[PDB]
C-alpha cells in the first residue's frame, strides 16, 4: 500500500469485507440494509480502476459474498463426497471462486466501458450489466443463481415491486440505489442522495396493492407431515418399514379432519413400482374419509427403449386424485442439482470399465412445463426443493386457476447451517410474486405456510417430528408479474443498456 484507499491492496481487502457484509442481508440474519452497504462497497471500490484491477476487486467482493454465504455446501460434500477433509475445503473455495467470476466479470466490463465515476455508470450501466451478469451465473452450466439481493428484502420497503416486475427488479433497483449512494459519498454531492432516497421511497406505497382476491369459500384445513427421518446409512426393508410407519401413523388421525395432506420430497424411500399395493390401499383409506395426499417418491419407469429412467416425483392420492401408475396427475423433477442428482460430463464412461469405478447412476429430467397437480378439486403448481428458487420456471408453470403454490424438499443435508434458511427465504418470494399461498413441507428443514404477500402464516421448528395443521385460503388474482413475467425488466434492461452502451461508444 502507499496512500489511503487509492492503492489496490487495500481495496481487495475492503471488497472482501463488503462482500461478506452481504451475507447478513439474507434469511438467518435478516438485515436488509446490509445489501445496500454491500453493493455500495462493490460500486465505490471499482471507481477509478483499470478494467483488470476492477475485475480483481469484483472477484474479491464475490469471494467475500459467496465464501461467507455459500460455505454451507461443505457439509454435503464432506458427508457424501468420499473425499479427504482438505479436498472438501478446496472444493468449497473452488465453488465460491467460480461464482465470483461473474462478479469479477461485472466489474471488469463496467470499468472498461464506463471508467469515469458518473451517475450514468452507477444508476444506468451497472443495474443493466448486473442484470445480465447475474443471469449468466444463473443460466450457465445448469444454474445456481443463489444469493440474489432482491430476496434479502421480502420484509423490507421495496417488497411492493415484486408482484409487478419480480425479484430481479429489486436486484436491479438495489444496485441502482446503492450506486447513487456510493456516488454521493465519493463525490461529496447530495443530489444523488436525494435521487436514491426518492428512488428507494417511491416503491413503498406499492406494498399496499393487493393484486389477488381471497376466497373464504375454498378455505381448507391442510396438513404437512414433517418426519425427522435421518439420512440413510444402510437401506433394509426394516428402515423402509420404519419410515412408512412414521408417516402413516401421523397421517391417519388427520384423514377425516384435513382436506389435504402433504409428504416431503422422496418421503417414500422406495421405487414407486414396488409399492403399488401400499399406494392403492392408502388411496382407498383417504377417499373414504374425503381427504387427499401429496407425497414425494422415487419413480423408475420403463422407457419405450426398455431401459430404466428414474425421476424425482410427486404423486397424488385421495379424493379427486385416483392413484394410477400411468395417471397424468403427478410431478417429475425437471432441473437436477449438478453433482447431487446427476453426473456432469457423463462421457467419461470410457476409462470406467478398466481402472476405477465411477458412479453411473443419474436421475432423469421431467418436462419443463407440467400440468398443475389436481387433488381434492385443488390445483397445485409444484416444485421440488431447488426448483422453487427458479422464478421464471415457477411462473411459467403457474396457471391462473392455481389455488396454491407447493414445494416439497429435503433439507436434511445442510442441517444446522444457514443454507436451509436462505432456501426458505427465496421460497417466500414465489408466493409474493404470484399472490398465492405457498405450502412448503420438508423432511427436516423449514416447514411453513406462506400467504400471498410473503407473510408467514404458520411454521414449525426444525429438527422435530411434527405435523403442521392450519387453515389456508386460496386466492384467484393475477399479478402483473404472472402475466408479463420478467419481460418488462429485460426491456428496461435493454433500454438502460442500449443507452449506456451508446453513450460509452460515443
Ligand atoms: C482460489 C480463490 C482465490 C481466493 C480469493 C481471495 C483473494 C483475497 O482476498 O486476497 C486479498 C488479500 O487480502 C490482499 O489484500
Ligand atoms: C461499515 C458498515 C457495517 C455495517 C454492518 C451491519 C451489521 C448489522 C449486524 C446485525 C446482526 C444481526 C444478527 O446478529 O442476527 C444474527 C443471527 O440471528 C444470530 O446469529
Ligand atoms: C472474508 C470471508 C471469506 C470466507 C471464504 C472462506 C471459505 C470458508 C470455507 O470454505 O469453510 C467452509 C465452512 O467452514 C464449512 O461450514
Ligand atoms: C461487516 C463485516 C462482517 C460481515 C461478515 C459476515 C459473515 C457472516 O455472515 O458469517 C456467516 C458464516 O459464513 C456462516 O457460515
Ligand atoms: C467436484 C465435486 C465432486 C463432489 C460432489 C459429490 C457430492 O458432494 O455428492 C453429494 C451427494 O450426492 C448429495 O446427495
Ligand atoms: C466448476 C466447479 C464449481 C464448483 C464445483 C465444486 C463443488 C460442487 C459440489 C457441491 C454441490 C454438490 C452437493 C450435492 C447436493 O447438494 O445435493 C443436494 C440434493 O441432492 C439436492 O437438493
Ligand atoms: C475486461 C474484462 C475482464 C473480465 C475477466 C473475467 C473474469 C475475471 C475475474 C478474475 C480476476 C482476474 C484477475 C486479473 C489479474 O490478476 O490481473 C493481473 C494484473 O492486473 C496484470 O497486470
Ligand atoms: C445477452 C443475454 C440475454 C439473455 C436473455 C435470455 C433470457 O431472458 O433468459 C430468461 C431468464 O431465464 C430469465 O432470468
Ligand atoms: C447470446 C445469448 C446468450 C445465450 C442465453 C440465451 C438462453 O439460453 O435463453 C435462456 C433460456 O430461455 C432459459 O434457459
Ligand atoms: C449512506 C451514504 C450517504 C452518503 C451521503 C454523503 C453526502 O450526502 O455528502 C454530503 C453533501 O455533499 C453535503 O455537502
Ligand atoms: C426497476 C426500477 C427502474 C426505475 C427507473 C426509474 C427512473 C430512472 C432514473 C435514473 C436517473 C437518476 C440519476 C440522477 C442522478 O443521479 O443525478 C445526480 C446528480 O445530478 C449528478 O450531479
Ligand atoms: C420520498 C421522500 C424523498 C425525500 C428526499 C430527501 O429527503 O432528501 C433530503 C436530503 O437527505 C437532504 O440532504
Ligand atoms: C457448476 C455449477 C455450480 C453448481 C454447484 C452445485 C450447488 O450449488 O449445490 C447447491 C445445492 O444443491 C442447493 O440445493
Ligand atoms: C417505480 C415503480 C413503478 C411501478 C409501476 C406501478 C404500477 C404499474 C402496474 C400497472 C398495472 C399493469 C396492468 C397489469 C394487470 O392489470 O394485470 C392484471 C391482468 O389481469 C393480467 O393479465
Ligand atoms: C445480445 C442478445 C440479444 C438476443 C435477445 C433475444 C433473446 O435472446 O431472447 C431469447 C428468448 O427470450 C428465448 O425464449
Ligand atoms: C459487452 C457489452 C455489455 C453490455 C451490458 C449491457 C447490455 C444489455 C443489452 C441487452 C441485454 C439483452 C436484452 C434482451 C431483451 C430480451 C430478453 C427477453 O425478452 O427474454 C425474456 C423472456 O421472458 C425469457 O423468458
Residue numbers in the entry: 3 to 508
Direct quotes from the study:
The rest are acted on by the third and last enzyme in the PTM pathway, apolipoprotein N-acyltransferase, Lnt18. This transferase N-acylates the Cys* of the apo-lipoprotein using preferentially phosphatidylethanolamine (PE) as a lipid substrate and generating the triacylated lipoprotein product218192021. Lnt is a member of the nitrilase family of enzymes with two domains, a membrane domain (MD) and a periplasmic nitrilase-like domain (ND) harbouring the enzyme’s active site. The active site, defined by the catalytic triad, resides in the ND slightly above the membrane surface with an opening for substrates and products that leads into the bulk membrane.
The LntPae structure and that of an inactive Cys387Ala mutant of LntEco were solved by molecular replacement using the native LntEco structure as the search model. In support of this, the structures of Lnt solved in the course of this study contain a varying number of structured monoolein lipid molecules from the mesophase in which crystallization occurs. In the LntEco-Cys387Ala mutant structure, where lipid density is well defined and plentiful in this region of the protein, the lipids arrange themselves in single file along the hydrophobic pocket entrance into the active site. In the C387A mutant structure, a row of single monoolein lipid molecules appears corralled in this proposed portal formed by Arm 1, Arm 3 and the H3/H4 cleft that connects the active site pocket with the bulk membrane. It makes sense therefore that this conduit can be navigated by phospholipid substrate molecules, especially in a sideways orientation with the sn-1 chain on point. In several of the crystal structures solved in the course of this work host lipid molecules are visible extending deep into the binding pocket and next to Cys387. These observations suggest that the positions occupied by the structured lipids define the route to the active site taken by the phospholipid and lipoprotein substrates of Lnt.
